[PDB]
DNA sequence: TTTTGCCATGTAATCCCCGGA
DNA sequence: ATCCGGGGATTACATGGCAAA
């Protein structure tokens, strides 16, 4: 269970105030510019979503 | 993965019935009808799924 | 205070079904 | 039947905090 890093977790909650949707392309880049598995972005989105829902 | 499999004609006639009351399963009813129509859960889960589409 | 013990909260990941193609 | 990504719920584990001799 990967601990993202802090200048990884900046960029990923400024993508998601930008869109809170990952299309395929802006999955496919973050992945290459924060060095993580596309799988891992994905998860990370779908669970901040479930989180601001219960905000 | 899963092989496609027939549907006896009591089963499609058993899956139709129940489709006709309700067009979703819950695990427990389809544990039941497993074990009744000798019918696999996923095969029963993807024939409502199907069935969902098609009426749709 | 220190330093220890543990338990609550956070969160990455998995389960499991859904619709659409 | 398969694939995907979506949701909701749950799991599994790290660490945040507070307790306390």
Redesign the pocket.
């Known amino acids: 269970?990967?601990?993202?890093s802090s200048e990884q977790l900046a960029r990923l909650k400024r993508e998601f105030n930008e869109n809170r949707?990952?299309t395929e392309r802006r999955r496919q880049q973050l992945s290459s510019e924060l060095g993580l598995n596309e799988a891992?972005i994905?998860?990370?989105?779908?669970?901040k979503?479930?989180?601001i829902?219960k905000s």
């Open positions: 269970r990967t601990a993202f949707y990952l891992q994905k998860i990370w989105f779908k669970n979503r479930a989180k829902k």
